[PDB]
Amino acid sequence: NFLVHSSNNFGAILSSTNVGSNTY
Amino acid sequence: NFLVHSSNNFGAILSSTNVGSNTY
Amino acid sequence: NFLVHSSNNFGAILSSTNVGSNTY
Amino acid sequence: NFLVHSSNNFGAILSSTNVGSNTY
Amino acid sequence: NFLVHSSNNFGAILSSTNVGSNTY
Amino acid sequence: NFLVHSSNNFGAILSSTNVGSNTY
Amino acid sequence: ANFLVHSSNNFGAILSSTNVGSNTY
Amino acid sequence: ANFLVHSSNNFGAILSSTNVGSNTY
Amino acid sequence: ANFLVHSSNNFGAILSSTNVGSNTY
Amino acid sequence: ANFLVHSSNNFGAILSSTNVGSNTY
Amino acid sequence: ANFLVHSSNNFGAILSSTNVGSNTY
Amino acid sequence: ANFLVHSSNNFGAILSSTNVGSNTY
Amino acid sequence: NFLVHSSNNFGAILSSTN
Amino acid sequence: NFLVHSSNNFGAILSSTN
Amino acid sequence: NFLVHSSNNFGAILSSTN
Amino acid sequence: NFLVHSSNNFGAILSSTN
Amino acid sequence: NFLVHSSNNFGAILSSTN
Amino acid sequence: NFLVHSSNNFGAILSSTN
C-alpha cells in the first residue's frame, strides 16, 4: 500500500467566515 | 494498491461565507 | 489497483455563500 | 505501508473568522 | 510502516479570530 | 515503524485572537 | 395609536445542519 | 401612542451544527 | 408615549456546534 | 414618556462548542 | 421621562467550550 | 427624569473552557 | 370562574388550569 | 376565581394553576 | 382569588400557583 | 388572595406560590 | 394576602411564598 | 399581609416568605 498526497498552492487566498447573529 | 493525489493551485481565490441571521 | 487523481487550477475563483435569514 | 503527505504553500493567505453576536 | 509528513510554508499569513459578543 | 514529521516556516505570521465580550 | 410591529413566536423544535466546503483546487 | 416594536419569543428546543472548511489547495 | 423597543425572550434549550478550519494549503 | 429600550431575557439552558484551526500550510 | 435602557437578565445554565489553534506551518 | 442605564443580572451557573495555542512552526 | 381578557396582544399569553 | 387581564402584551405571560 | 393585571408588558411575567 | 399588578415591564417578573 | 405592585420594572423581581 | 411596591427597579429584588 503506497499512498501519496501532494498539495501545492501558489495563489493568494482570502477567506471570510461569519457565523451567528441569531436572535432567540 | 498505489494511490496518488495531486492538487496544484495557481489562481487567486476569494471566498465569503455567512451563516445565521435567523430570528426565533 | 493504480489510481491517480489530478486537479490543476489556473483561474481566479470567487465564491459567495449565504445561509440563513429565516424567521420562525 | 508507505504513506507520504506533502503540503507546500507559496501564497499569501488572509483569513478572518467571526463567531457570535447572538442575542438570547 | 513508513510514514512521512512534510509542511513547508513560504507565504505571509495573517489570521484574525473573534469569538463572543453574545448577550444573554 | 518509522515516522518522520517536518515543519519548515519561512513566512511572516501575524495572528490575533479575541475571546469574550459576553454579557450575562 | 400608530403601531409598527414585527413579531415572531416559535413553539416548535428546530434542527439545522449546514456543511460548506470540501472543494479541491 | 406611537409604538415601534421588534419582539421575538422562543419556546422550542433548537439544535444547530455548522461545518466550514476541509478545502485542499 | 413613544416606545422604541427591541425585546427577546427565550425559554428553550439551545445547542450549537461550530467547526471552522481543516484546510490544507 | 419616551422609551428607547433593548431587553433580553433568557430562561433556557445553552450549550456551545467552537473549534477553529487545524490548518496545515 | 426619557429612558435609554439596555438590560439583560439570565436565569439559565450556560456551558461554553472554545478551541483555537492546532495549525502546522 | 433622564435615565441612561446599562444593567445586567445573572442567576445561572456558567462554565467556560478556553484553549489557545498548540501551533507548530 | 376562568376568564382571560386580552387587548393588542403581540406576544404569547399562556394560561393553564389543572 | 381565576382572572387574567392583559393590555398591549408584547412579551410572554405564563399563568399556571394546579 | 387569583388576579393578574398587566399593562405595556414587553418582558416575561410568570405566575405559578400550586 | 394572590394578585400581580405590572406596568411597563421590560424585565422578568417571577411569582411562585406553593 | 399577597400583593405585588411594580412600576417601570427593568430588572428582575422575584417573590416566592411557601 | 405581604406587599411589595417597586418603582424604577433596575437591580434585583428578592423576597422570600416561609
Numbering used by the authors:
A (entry chain K), B (entry chain N), C (entry chain Q), D (entry chain H), E (entry chain E), F (entry chain B): 14 to 37
G (entry chain P), H (entry chain M), I (entry chain J), J (entry chain G), K (entry chain D), L (entry chain A): 13 to 37
M (entry chain R), N (entry chain O), O (entry chain L), P (entry chain I), Q (entry chain F), R (entry chain C): 14 to 31
Paper's wording?
Islet amyloid polypeptide (IAPP, or amylin) is a 37-residue peptide hormone that is cosecreted with insulin and one of the most amyloid-prone sequences known. Overproduction and aggregation of IAPP leads to amyloid deposition in the islets of Langerhans, a pathological hallmark of type-2 diabetes. Although the precise link between IAPP aggregation and disease remains uncertain, IAPP aggregates have been shown to be toxic in cell-based assays, and genetic and animal studies implicate islet amyloid in the progressive loss of pancreatic β-cell function. Over 40 different proteins, with diverse native structures or in many cases intrinsic disorder, form amyloid associated with human disease, yet all amyloid fibrils share a common cross-β architecture consisting of a continuous intermolecular β-sheet supported by networks of zipper and ladder-like interactions. Amyloid fibrils have a similar cross-β architecture, but fibrils formed by a single protein sequence can have diverse structures, varying with time, self-assembly conditions, and sequence modifications.
Cryo-EM was performed on fibrils assembled from 30 μM IAPP in the same buffer used for kinetic assays (160 mM ammonium acetate, pH 7.4, 1% v/v DMSO), in the absence (4 replicates) or presence (2 replicates each) of 50 μM YX-I-1, canagliflozin, or doxazosin. Fibrils were imaged after 2 weeks, at which point fibril formation was at a steady state, as judged by analyzing aliquots with ThT. Fibrils with a similar morphology were observed for the control (no small molecule) and doxazosin-containing samples, with the majority having a twisted ribbon morphology and crossover distances of 60–100 nm. Following helical reconstruction, multiple distinct IAPP fibril polymorphs were resolved, revealing further detail on the apparent morphological differences between the samples. The majority of fibrils formed in the control (69%) and doxazosin-treated (72%) samples were classified into three related fibril structures (named LL, LLU, and LLUU, respectively), which have a shared structural core consisting of a pair of protofilaments related by a 21-screw symmetry. Each protofilament is formed from a single stack of L-shaped IAPP subunits, with straight β-strand segments encompassing 13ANFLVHSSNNF23 and 25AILSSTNVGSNTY37-NH2, hinging on a turn at Gly24. In addition, further flanking subunits presenting U-shaped IAPP subunit conformations and ambiguous β-strands were observed adhering to these two β-sheets, with the combinations of these flanking subunits differing to generate the three individual polymorphs LL, LLU, and LLUU. Thus, out of the fibril structures that were identified in each data set, YX-I-1 fibrils consisted of 89% C-fold subunits, whereas this subunit fold was absent from fibrils grown in the control or with doxazosin. By contrast, the control and doxazosin-treated samples consisted of L-fold (62% or 72%, respectively), U-fold (34% or 28%), and S-fold (4% or 0%) subunits.
